[PDB]
Design brief:
part of a larger assembly; 2 chains; A: about 55 residues; mainly alpha; rod-shaped; B: about 450 residues; Cytochrome Bc1 Complex, Chain A, domain 1; globular; binds phosphatidylethanolamine; membrane protein; oxidoreductase; electron transport chain; YALI0A17468p
């Protein structure tokens, strides 16, 4: 254990910062899906009537 | 100071309203009805317009030919139009031909034949009208505009109705429509020009006294519309001119913001490259558009109905690579009604409107149309003194407050016809309804 700490002494801080990053990034991913769908809905929902000239 | 509008009622509830002008020798009498296409359902949509054709096709007394001759002999003419909320039937004549004209109008409204043979004949004429409106681009644009703004609602239907209904309209449903809708409490007999009010009331008692009254008489101009932000694109690369309308939900006739909406509309104003003075107009949009050749014309509008309205602008342009600029600059001028307008623009627009609302009424038909419209939408003719007071009450704060709740960051209905490849998608147009700097 001690030697593992000696090789990577940032270990504890790194994993806590990673937890914060995971949470924020996941929420941003969820919101980015909502926003993309919101903005794209006029394109996805478009309908056509064709009357050949 | 114009002469006072006199108003009387009959017993059935028919209103008579008149404004005499002893300087003219002609008169416009007619019947304004608080009824139109909006009163149809989906199955009989087109009936009101169908009736307007049959009204001139012969009555129980005069045949089609006799009707023609009787009017020819009068010397003036008869005219009619059906809209979404209003039907009008009027007769322009000589001063002393007014009793003839009232009698003919009373006949065609109350005592029309609606003969199966004539229904069948008009059924083709009206079918041909479906393929020839196609040319009147402004009407094409505004009919699509109503269809999309009031998607699947009665205001969204056209006046002509679908082809399917035209083929299935019977004399029964025609008769039913005019029996339910053309009632005395919904009708106004209007005379303007060389008419005596007391003479017109006597003629009303003679011809329109046996009109049905409705079971539940509501006041004149009594109506829920749910506006849909949406777009119709009718791209046609072979057309040289693009026609674009953009509108938001506007104000009804009786809104408290009715005058505020008119002032805001006057701040943007109209423009037409073919008119000499248009390059010098005060409107900011006019200056941008004229300096940059962005459009052949634009026309701001504020259409009202009993319970809603559409406020917006109609643009025509040959500049097909700068449609984006035209739309961008137009909507940025709308943004400024929310963010920037001050007493400078507001007082200028009020000045221009105080005259404009009076100027419009320059002939007997315009006066009659004004009395008829006001009586069927508000229940009274509003005096110019009252109109001057309501306009004066509009402040810059009122305009900004109205624009912030009606225009700012709101959904639009958008119709484009012609070479509109350069018109961007809905989001980019709707994003111009706000300013990120504000
Ligand atoms: C270069 C590599 C880019 C990838 C960045 C991912 C995470 C790096 C952030 C550092 C970090 O550990 O931040 C954590 C939070 O993560 C987060 O919440 C950050 C995730 C955010 C993802 C991207 C959002 C914008 C970032 C890029 C913009 C940079 C320039 C623009 C001005 C916790 O750290 P802490 O909370 O202790 O931090 C002190 C403030 N309390």
């Amino acid at each position: 254990a001690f030697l593992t700490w000696a090789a990577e002494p940032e270990h504890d801080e790194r994993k806590k910062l990673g937890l914060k990053a995971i949470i924020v990034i996941s929420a941003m991913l969820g919101l980015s899906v909502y926003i993309k769908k919101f903005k794209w809905s006029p394109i996805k929902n478009r309908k056509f009537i064709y009357n050949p000239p | 100071v114009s002469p006072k509008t006199r108003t009387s009622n009959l017993k059935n509830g028919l209103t008579i309203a008149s404004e005499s002008n002893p300087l003219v020798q002609t008169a416009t009498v007619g019947v304004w009805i608080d009824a139109g296409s909006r009163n149809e359902n989906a199955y009989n949509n087109g009936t009101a317009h169908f009736f307007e054709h049959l009204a001139f096709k012969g009555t129980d007394k005069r045949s089609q030919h006799q009707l023609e001759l009787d009017i020819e002999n009068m010397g003036g003419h008869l005219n009619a139009y059906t809209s979404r909320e209003s039907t009008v039937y009027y007769a322009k004549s000589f001063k002393d031909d007014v009793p003839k004209s009232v009698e003919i109008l009373a006949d065609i409204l109350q005592h029309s034949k609606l003969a199966e043979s004539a229904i069948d004949r008009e059924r083709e004429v009206i079918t041909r009208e479906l393929e020839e409106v196609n040319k009147q681009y402004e009407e094409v644009v505004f009919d699509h505009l109503h269809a999309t703004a009031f998607m699947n609602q009665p205001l969204g239907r056209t006046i002509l109705g679908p082809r399917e209904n035209i083929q299935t309209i019977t004399n029964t449903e025609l008769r039913k429509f005019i029996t339910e809708n053309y009632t005395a409490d919904r009708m106004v007999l209007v005379g303007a020009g060389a008419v005596d009010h007391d003479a017109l009331v006597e003629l009303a008692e003679k011809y329109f006294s046996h009109l049905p009254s409705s079971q539940s008489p509501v006041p004149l101009g009594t109506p829920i519309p749910n506006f849909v932000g949406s777009e119709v694109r009718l791209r046609d690369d072979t057309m040289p001119v693009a026609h674009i309308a953009i509108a938001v939900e506007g104000v009804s006739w009786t809104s408290e913001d009715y005058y505020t909406a008119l002032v805001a509309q006057a701040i943007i104003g109209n423009y037409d490259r073919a008119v000499g003075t248009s390059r010098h107009q005060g409107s900011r949009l006019s200056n941008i558009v004229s300096e940059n050749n962005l459009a052949n014309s634009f026309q701001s509008f504020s259409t009202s109905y009993s319970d809603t309205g559409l406020w917006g602008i109609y643009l025509t342009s040959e500049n097909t690579t700068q449609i984006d600029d035209l739309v961008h600059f137009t909507l940025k001028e709308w943004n400024r009604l929310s963010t920037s307008v001050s007493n400078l623009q507001v007082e200028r627009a009020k000045s221009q409107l105080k005259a404009g609302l009076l100027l419009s009424l320059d002939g007997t038909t315009y006066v009659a149309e004004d009395i008829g419209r006001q009586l069927t939408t508000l229940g009274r003719r509003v005096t110019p003194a009252e109109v001057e007071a309501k306009l004066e009450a509009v402040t810059e704060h009122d305009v900004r407050a109205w624009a912030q709740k009606t225009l700012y960051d709101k959904d639009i209905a958008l119709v484009g016809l012609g070479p509109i490849e350069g018109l961007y998608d809905y989001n980019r147009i709707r994003n111009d309804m706000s300013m990120m700097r504000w």
